[PDB]
Structure 1
Amino acid sequence: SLNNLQNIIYNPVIPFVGTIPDQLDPGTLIVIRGHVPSDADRFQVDLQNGSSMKPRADVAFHFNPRFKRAGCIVCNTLINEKWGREEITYDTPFKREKSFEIVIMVLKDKFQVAVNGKHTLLYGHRIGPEKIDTLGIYGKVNIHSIGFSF
């Protein structure tokens, strides 16, 4: 499953913005390992069409764990600097002060996300995955490694 994983970024400064080195075709994996700090309110993993900041680049897949109250994961898409319809997942595996491994698997019609070896959620494509060339990681999170399996 991770036998083809190639980690290429270690302990990046957050915020991290980096070009994805290949097209996110079906079967592609994005693997992100790190920690949630004790004071974390939220962090996000954004799969972006480009790295523009002004105006803000479209986010095909916003994967946004939030830790207040019982915690959740918000997923959404940003187009023309505007958010679409939120898909909220309340069964979240993330915890402050806990390590994690996020595996984002890119499928034909959706993303399938597993955390710590366990399925977490699905997100149907709203932007064609071929337009995704940039990985952004923002917020209160510590990242040990970013890798890809194409």
Structure 2
Amino acid sequence: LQNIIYNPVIPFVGTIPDQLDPGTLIVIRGHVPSDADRFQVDLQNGSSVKPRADVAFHFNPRFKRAGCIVCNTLINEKWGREEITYDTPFKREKSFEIVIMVLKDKFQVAVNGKHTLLYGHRIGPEKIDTLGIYGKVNIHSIGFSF
């Protein structure tokens, strides 16, 4: 793993150190705190706050009731169709590893050593240069393989 970021402060907004070509991994190890209702990993085009940077890939675990993962894309400050994965491995007070693998046509995401979901590209992954992590989460490490 390359360009590892250790224990970043959340909210984190970092420049991804290379283009996300097919086969690239983003690996994120962390922990959901006991009072967490949600957090998010956003692959974004730039880091503008107003107007809000486009989010190619919004990966948003949610913990209310039985919980779920919501995926979407933000284009021109509008959210598109939500893709909700209900078989969620995330739990409050548990550790996790997320591996996002960028393929040509989709993202392939594995959580805790197990395939979790797919997400077809809506914005070309070549437009992504920024990783954002927000909400209630404790991130121990961010690693990249190009």
TM over 0.5: yes
CA distance in 2, matches of 1:71, 1:40: 11
- In structure 1, stretches of 5+ residues that fail to align are none
Deviation at 1:66? 0.1
For 1:1-150, list aligned pairs within 5 A: 5-150=1-146
Q: Structure 1: how far apart are the matches of 2:41 and 2:62?
A: 12
SS of match in other structure, 1:138: strand
Measure the CA separation in 2 of the matches of 1:148 and 1:133. 13
SS state at 1:26 partner: coil
> 2:3 touches 2:17 (CA, 8 Å); kept in 1?
no
Superposed CA deviations along residues 22-42 of structure 1, whole A, max 9, x for unmatched, are 000000000000000000000
1:97 CA displacement: 0.3
Measured after TM superposition, the shift of residue 8 of structure 1 is 1.7
Question: Would the aligned equivalents of 1:45 and 1:136 in 2 still touch at CA under 8 Å?
Answer: yes
SS class of match (2:35): coil
Q: After superposition, what is the alpha-carbon deviation per residue over 1:44-91, rounded to whole angstroms, capped at 9, x for unaligned?
A: 000000000011000000000000010000000000000000000000
Tell me if structure 2 keeps the 8 A contact 1:49–1:132: yes
Aligned partners of 1:90, 1:6: CA distance in 2, in Å?
32
Q: Are the counterparts in 2 of residues 48 and 135 from structure 1 also a CA contact under 8 Å? A: yes
Cα distance in 2 for residues equivalent to 1:82 and 1:9: 30
Contact 1:24 1:132 in 2 (8 A): yes
Unpaired runs of 5+ residues, structure 2, are none
- Give TM-score, length-normalised by structure 2: 0.99
Identity of counterpart residues, as a percentage?
99
C-alpha separation in 1, matches of 2:130 and 2:145 = 15
Residue 7 of structure 1 contacts residue 145 of structure 1 at CA under 8 Å; is this kept in 2?
no
> What SS is found at the alignment partner of 1:130?
helix
CA distance in 1, matches of 2:8, 2:88: 24
Is contact 1:42-1:66 (8 Å) kept?
yes
Distance 1:7 1:121 in 2: 25
Contact kept in structure 1, 2:51 and 2:77, CA below 8 Å? yes
Give TM-score, length-normalised by structure 1.
Answer: 0.96
SS of 2:60's equivalent in the other structure is strand
User: 1:7 deviation in Å?
Assistant: 4.8
